[PDB]
Amino acid sequence: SRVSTRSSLAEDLRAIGLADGDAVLVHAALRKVGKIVGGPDDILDAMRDVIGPAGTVLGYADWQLEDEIRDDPAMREHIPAFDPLRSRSIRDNGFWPELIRTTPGALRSASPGASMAAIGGEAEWFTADHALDYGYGPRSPLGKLVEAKGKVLMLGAPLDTMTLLAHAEHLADFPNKRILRYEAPILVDGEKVWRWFEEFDTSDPPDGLADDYFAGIVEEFLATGRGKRGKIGEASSVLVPADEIVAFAVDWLERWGRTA
Amino acid sequence: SRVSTRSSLAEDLRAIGLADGDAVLVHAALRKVGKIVGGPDDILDAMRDVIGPAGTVLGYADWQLEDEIRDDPAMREHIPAFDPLRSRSIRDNGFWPELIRTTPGALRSASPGASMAAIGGEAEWFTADHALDYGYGPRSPLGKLVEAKGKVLMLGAPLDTMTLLAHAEHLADFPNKRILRYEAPILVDGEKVWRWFEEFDTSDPPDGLADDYFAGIVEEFLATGRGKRGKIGEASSVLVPADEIVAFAVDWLERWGRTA
Ligand SMILES: CC(C)(COP(=O)(O)OP(=O)(O)OC[C@H]1O[C@@H](n2cnc3c(N)ncnc32)[C@H](O)[C@@H]1OP(=O)(O)O)[C@@H](O)C(=O)NCCC(=O)NCCS
Ligand SMILES: CC(C)(COP(=O)(O)OP(=O)(O)OC[C@H]1O[C@@H](n2cnc3c(N)ncnc32)[C@H](O)[C@@H]1OP(=O)(O)O)[C@@H](O)C(=O)NCCC(=O)NCCS
Ligand SMILES: CN[C@@H]1[C@@H](O[C@H]2O[C@H](CO)[C@@H](N)[C@H](O)[C@H]2O)O[C@H]2C[C@@H](N)[C@@H](O[C@H]3[C@H](O)[C@@H](O)[C@H](N)C[C@@H]3N)O[C@@H]2[C@@H]1O
Ligand SMILES: CN[C@@H]1[C@@H](O[C@H]2O[C@H](CO)[C@@H](N)[C@H](O)[C@H]2O)O[C@H]2C[C@@H](N)[C@@H](O[C@H]3[C@H](O)[C@@H](O)[C@H](N)C[C@@H]3N)O[C@@H]2[C@@H]1O
Ligand SMILES: [Cl-]
C-alpha cells in the first residue's frame, strides 16, 4: 500500500549501499518494487541521482533471436542482423534493460548474446570493445565491472539471474567446460554478414550442478557477511561488490571441479 | 497459419494501397499479425521500404500521467514533467507507438495527451509546433496529415481507435462541445513547470452517441467505396485516405448536430 517516489527510492538505494561514483549492473523484477509515481523510470533517475554523473548504470540486454529461428535455414535471409543501436533486448530479462537501452544517451555493446546497455559517465568505456567470442570474458562489460570495482544490484530479481557469475564461469579452471559454437547475423560497416561465434556455454550449467546454482553461490557469499540486503521500494534486493563475488565464485568453482 | 517476413509484409502493404512517398498514421493490435521472423520491427521496416525515404510513419503516443495522481496535491512535486524525448507512450495504445518512438531517428511532438511519434522524411514537420491547447486542432500532426493528404491504417486495431476522427470533432460545428481543463507538468527547456491546458473532450463522446461511434462512421465511409480492406500478415486491416474521412466525418457530425 506504499507508493515510491524518485526521492524515496534514492534513500532506499543509499541505504543498501549505492554511493557517489559507483558503477552498478542491475537485474530487476520491477513488479516487486510496487507502485511508483513516475513509473520505473524513477528508479533509473534515482540511481543517477545517487551515483552522480560520473557513475554508470547497466543492464543485460541480449537480443531476441531464438535459436530455433536462427537455425532454420528456410528463414535465414529473413532474420535481421544484430544491430546494437536497434535490436531490442531479450524480453526474458524484463523491461529493465529495455528501459535503459531506450533512454536517450544510453549505449549498447556489440557482442549480441552477451550485449549490455549502459548509461552514465563511463557508458562508452563499459560498452566499448566487447569481444564477439567468449563475450563473458575479460574483454567485456563484466570484466570491466570487476576492474572498475563496480557493484551488482539484484532489484527484486531472483539471485540466479546474476549474469556476472558467467564471467566467473569463464575464468574458473574446472574440467570439461562445455564450448558452444553457433552462427548469427551481424552488421560489418552497416551490411549483414553471418559470422561464426564461440563461447563457454551460458545456457546450461556445468554437468553435476543444478541449473540454478548461481543462487546458491550468492547466498553463500552473503553468509560471509559481505554484500547488503534491503528494500528498494517494496522489492527485496541485494547489493554486492563485483570483484569480491567473482573471486569467491572462481574458487567455489575451482574447488568443486577438483572433487570430480 | 504461417510466418510473415519483412518482404511478405511489404507486398501485403502494397496491396492495401501503401505507395511511394506516403505519410501514414498507424493504429495497431500487433498480436493479430501473427508470428514475424524479426518481430514487429519488421512491420515498420517493411513500411519504410514501401513508402521510401520521403515517406513518414506515425503513431499516437500520448503519455502515462494518470488523472488521479495528477490531481493529488501530495504527489505534486513527485510527478515527472512531460518530456517529448523521455516520457513513454501510454500503454493502452499498445506497443506500436513505443516501437516507433524508440526507433533511432524518430521524433515526438510537444503536446502531451495528443503527442504523436513519427519517423521518416517528413518526421520533423509532422511533429513540429504541436499546439498545447486543442492539440487535435489545426496546429496538430493530424491537421498536417490532412494537409499532406496522408493515410490512416488500422492494423488489426478496433476501428474506434482512429484518433484522426477526434480532429473531425474539433472541426465540426455541433452544439454543446465539452471543454476539458486540467493542469499538468511539462518540461520547459529542461525545467518542470505546471501549465493549465484546455481542449475539446476526447475522453467521452458528445452527449448523445455511443462510445464506439467512431467505428460505425468508418465502415460507413467504407460503404462509399473509398476505403480498402486487406490482411497484413494475419490481421484484418483497413486503410483510409485521411483528408476524405475527415470531410465525411465532419459533415456526419454537423448534420447529426441539427437533428439533436
Ligand atoms: C522474469 C522477471 C523479469 C519478471 O519480473 P516482472 O516484474 O514480472 O517483470 P518486469 O521486471 O519486466 O516488470 C514489469 C513492469 O513493467 C512496468 N513496465 C514495463 N514497460 C513499461 C512501460 N513501457 N511504461 C511503464 N511501465 C512499464 C510495469 O510495472 C510492468 O508491470 P505491469 O505490466 O504488471 O504493470 C524477473 O523475475 C527476473 O528474472 N528478472 C531478472 C532477469 C535478468 O536480468 N536475467 C538475466 C539473465 S538469466
Ligand atoms: C489494445 C490493443 C493495443 C491490444 O493489442 P495487442 O496486439 O493485444 O497488443 P500490442 O498491439 O501492444 O502488441 C502485442 C505484441 O507485442 C510484441 N511486442 C511488444 N513489445 C515487444 C518488444 N519489446 N519486443 C518484441 N516484441 C514486442 C508482442 O508480439 C506482443 O505480444 P505478446 O506479448 O503476446 O507476445 C489493440 O486491441 C488496440 O485497441 N489497438 C489500437 C490502439 C490505439 O491506436 N489507440 C488510439 C487511441 S484511442
Ligand atoms: C537458472 N535458471 C534459468 C531459468 O530460470 C527461469 O525459468 C525457470 C523455468 O523453470 C524458472 N523456474 C525460474 O524461476 C526462472 O528464473 O531461465 C532460463 C531462460 C533460458 N532462456 C536461459 O537463459 C540464459 C540464456 O540462454 C543465455 O544466453 C544467457 N547468457 C543467460 C540466460 N540466463 O536459461 C535460463 C536458466 O535455465
Ligand atoms: C471508447 N473506448 C476507449 C477505450 O478503449 C475501449 O473502449 C471501450 C471501453 O470503454 C471498449 N469497449 C473498446 O473495446 C475499447 O476500444 O480506451 C480508453 C482509454 C482511456 N485512456 C481513454 O483514452 C482517451 C484519452 O484519455 C484521451 O486523452 C484521448 N484524447 C482519446 C483516448 N481515446 O478513453 C479510451 C476510450 O474509452
Ligand atoms: Cl539465447
Residue numbers in the entry:
A (entry chain A), B (entry chain B): 3 to 262
Copy the relevant paper text.
Here, we conduct a comprehensive functional analysis of the Antibiotic_NAT family of aminoglycoside acetyltransferases. AMEs permanently alter the AG substrate, preventing them from binding to their target, the A-site of the 16S rRNA in the bacterial ribosome. The fold typical of the Antibiotic_NAT family is evident in all structures, composed of 13 α-helices and 8 β-strands, and determined structures superpose with pairwise RMSD’s 0.8–1.0 Å between 197 to 266 matching Cα atoms.
Notably, the meta-AAC0038 enzyme was also active against apramycin which inspired our structural analysis of this activity. Using the catalytically inactive His168Ala mutant of this enzyme, we were able to determine the crystal structures of ternary meta-AAC0038H168A•apramycin•CoA and the binary meta-AAC0038H168A•acetyl-CoA complexes. Notably, the I and III rings of apramycin were positioned out from the active site cleft and did not form interactions with the enzyme except for hydrogen bonds with the Asp94 and Asp162 sidechains. The ability to retain this AG molecule in the active site via very few contacts could explain the activity of meta-AAC0038 on this substrate resulting in the low-level resistance to apramycin which was not detected for the other representatives of Group 3 Antibiotic_NAT enzymes. According to our meta-AAC0038-apramycin complex structure, the binding of apramycin to this enzyme differed from its interactions to AAC(3)-IVa. The meta-AAC0038 and AAC(3)-IIIb structures superimpose with RMSD 0.54 Å across 219 Cα atoms, share all the minor subdomain structural elements, and show complete conservation of AG binding residues. However, the position corresponding to Glu223 in AAC(3)-IIIb is occupied by Asp213 in meta-AAC0038. Glu223 is positioned at the ring I binding site of apramycin, which may impact the ability of AAC(3)-IIIb to accommodate this AG as a substrate.
